[PDB]
Amino acid sequence: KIRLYQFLLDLLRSGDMKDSIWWVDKDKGTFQFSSKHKEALAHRWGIQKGNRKKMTYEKMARALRNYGKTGEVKKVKKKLTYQFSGEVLGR
DNA sequence: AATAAAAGGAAGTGGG
DNA sequence: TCCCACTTCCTTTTA
């Protein structure tokens, strides 16, 4: 199945959930979730994965934090903002 | 208090 | 066996 970072990058490219997620500086790979509309995006991630429970933004971001050590996605010190690595953006 | 973002340890599930 | 790539649950901290 698709990886979470790929699911998010694909959404940013397609623009299908523009009210839930957007680029801040696409050249840097920084992106931000909507405070009010992020749960709809989390729900879609869980359904795409076929998970047993409803996905929440909280559980999705728990998974996002695990990328910090390996580098695919890092938290930025701005509200609801993260950053893809150069490798993820190229690949 | 009410709300919310950010955090991570620990254990469970998937598909190798 | 035992890691992958999360998922789920619970509790804490800060604003």
Curated annotation (Swiss-Prot):
It is found in: Nucleus. Changing residue 43 to P: In AGM10; very low protein expression, if any, in peripheral blood mononuclear cells; when tested in transfected cells, decreased transcription activation; in vitro, fails to bind PU motif-containing DNA probes; does not affect interaction with IRF4 and IRF8, nor nuclear localization. Residues 2-85 bind DNA. DNA binds at residues 49, 62, 65, 75. Transmembrane segments: none annotated. In the bone marrow, concentrated in hematopoietic stem cell, lymphoid progenitor, myeloid lineage (granulocyte macrophage progenitors, classical dendritic cells, monocytes) and B-cell clusters. Among B-cells, predominantly expressed in pre-B1 cells. Expressed in germinal center B-cells. It comes from the Eukaryota. Induction: Highly expressed in both FV-P and FV-A-induced erythro-leukemia cell lines that have undergone rearrangements of the SPI1 gene due to the insertion of SFFV. Negatively regulated by microRNA-155 (miR-155). Pioneer transcription factor, which controls hematopoietic cell fate by decompacting stem cell heterochromatin and allowing other transcription factors to enter otherwise inaccessible genomic sites. Once in open chromatin, can directly control gene expression by binding genetic regulatory elements and can also more broadly influence transcription by recruiting transcription factors, such as interferon regulatory factors (IRFs), to otherwise inaccessible genomic regions. Transcriptionally activates genes important for myeloid and lymphoid lineages, such as CSF1R. Binds DNA as a monomer. Can form homomers. Directly interacts with CEBPD/NF-IL6-beta; this interaction does not affect DNA-binding properties of each partner. Interacts with NONO/p54(nrb). Interacts with RUNX1/AML1. Interacts with GFI1; the interaction represses SPI1 transcriptional activity, hence blocks SPI1-induced macrophage differentiation of myeloid progenitor cells. Interacts with CEBPE. Interacts with IRF4/Pip and IRF8. Interacts with JUN. Interacts with RB1. Interacts with TBP. Belongs to the ETS family. It is linked to Agammaglobulinemia 10, autosomal dominant: A form of agammaglobulinemia, a primary immunodeficiency characterized by profoundly low or absent serum antibodies and low or absent circulating B-cells due to an early block of B-cell development. Affected individuals develop severe infections in the first years of life. This is Transcription factor PU.1. It comes from Homo sapiens (Human). The chain holds residues 169 to 259 of 270 of the full protein.
